């Protein structure tokens, strides 16, 4: 039992010596996987713009829509039904990275976002924006409805799903969540009922970063806890669905999910983040500096401008660290199919016309 | 030593139970890595075309060159020094996936090929072509010279280098090498000195594949053995560097490296292949059916044509299984900088003009 059981001895020596191999092999693999995913993201865009035309609700059966033409997968055209105007404006055709048909599904739209969730997990900053005139589809796209949840809820589910997988690869993740609203260039903490003076200040240990004073920050326990935090904030956003839409339809909602990945037994951390934004309505009548300046910032980033004026508004200043270089931005342009919206519609599609144009 | 050494007992049980985990984890990783690499390849092209202008040799110090302009990294322009002609043809400007300046290095050109070597290892078929008029740079690009080796030698080194890494991931690779020459629509086995009737026939167990009768096939032992097989074939290609260039400058050299990856303890094989081709000179005076038909095939593949006439020539028929769908093609357009070559030069760059044009 000495010169007989030595077989069940160095066996561990050979075993453990083979485990460490695989381990370092797997870690280097992930490394290469991560880098390839980013090359794909970089190749696909980094700042992409999608178009989404929503279908008419049941209660709008009698609301006239203009004529829509879907050219392939990324070009859409619309023509006023006003024969007078139509023959005085000429073709209204626009292209985007992708055009989502009114019959497209919520799942259809997440297929475009999910790859970016992985990026956040790899340490990249992501920004998802929903743009458009009040009633175009912004909130339905980000939040969705019970029988058809949108981006945010799908992000939570996928996020905790990937964090699980990461467990068997070393790496443990913590999610820090904040929820805020910007209305008239003033910030509001959607997780508190006691408002304080919230300001966007220069991070203490990084002149290039930022932090918001007096915002509630919760480190998420699990999916349900985040679902609750989200429902709480949605309920506190109390966007005037009753009276005075001048504050609901005129304010931005920003949800930030800071993702911190830690890997003990190999040191090194990984800090990423997901910024989901339900923007203020873009229709025409400060109250909309942030949205105006956000438009400038995005277009500027697209024109590879040497100097971007982020501090120009509350919203751009808040997302500055997530609009950087390696940062990835996804901008959904929500649009209504109604003729009485035509004017506001080309205005929205024209933004995307300033995008691909550069 | 029974209820005391049980610690060095189930330890292996826990150990081995943890190794299998990592293993399956690593295999699935590679899987994802492989798929990402292919999405990158697909996004970059699949059939790309590069341009390479060689510098004048020392013994050509007095050979007049036309004027060359390098626009960014992928657009080149040339203007005849004949003032009469220049003002009668208009701009000669072309774009490629990448333009290699006459000062570019052999390393510079391999950076474009190496990613494709990985693809072959992942089970994809790759084709590398060197195109151009006699003296433009074809052979120097593929073979190179002692102090500056080209593509082929770099492919061998990188190939055996990656095969080594694969060892610690399961997967064992065998390399099957063949070397042939096509001159007047006749095949020649470059590893034998006893010529037989070599024909391109329909593979026995796959109406869509092919095989060449009577070609020497060697399963490579190691890098040196392949280096030898290559030097043997290069020496047998005896391309008329003496007299009658009408057979050296008029024939194609094709080197195929069939890569078979086997993974015991997970079954499943992986068959890929690398086809390195030194084409026949494209200058003007059958003797060049293969090169003419190869041009048609490539352009057709680019135009996503429903039916490609591969059997139209010996060379296209031989590469048919490696010009398929998932197949990746890289075509280098070798070009001389001399004024006395101007005519043949736009002819070469114009091929690439039919490429990006579609
Ligand atoms: N794609 C769609 N499919 C079905 N209903 C939609 C769709 N898009 C929007 N809606 C509907 O209209 C409302 C969504 O508001 P939204 O247009 O997102 O806001 P705003 O444009 O003011 O930001 C929901 O009640 C929803 O039923
Ligand atoms: N990039 C280069 N740098 C230095 N010398 C070159 C270069 N390209 C071609 N050459 C030279 O000219 C010869 C190569 O032949 P090549 O032009 O490849 O053949 P063909 O165009 O007839 O297929 C070599 O002897 C080499 O010295």
Curated annotation (Swiss-Prot), chains A, B:
MF terms from GO for this chain are: ATP binding; hydrolase activity; microtubule binding; minus-end-directed microtubule motor activity; protein homodimerization activity
Could you state one GO cellular component term attached to this entry? spindle
Give the consequence of mutating residue 254 to F.
In ncd(D); reduces motor velocity and shows abnormal chromosomal segregation
Task: Detail which positions bind ATP.
Answer: 132-139
Location within or outside the cell = Cytoplasm, Cytoskeleton
Enumerate the residue ranges of region (Required for minus-end directionality).
352-356
List the catalytic activities from the record: ATP + H2O = ADP + phosphate + H(+)
* Known EC number: 3.6.4.-
What's the superkingdom here?
A: Eukaryota
Q: Which GO biological process annotations does it have?
A: cell division; chromosome segregation; distributive segregation; meiotic spindle assembly; meiotic spindle organization; microtubule bundle formation; minus-end directed microtubule sliding; mitotic centrosome separation
- Task performed by this protein: Minus-end-directed microtubule-based motor protein. Has ATPase activity. Required for normal chromosomal segregation in meiosis in females, and in early mitotic divisions of the embryo.
Q: What is this protein called?
A: Protein claret segregational
Q: From which organism does this entry originate?
A: Drosophila melanogaster (Fruit fly)
Report which part of the complete sequence is shown: 303 to 670 of 700
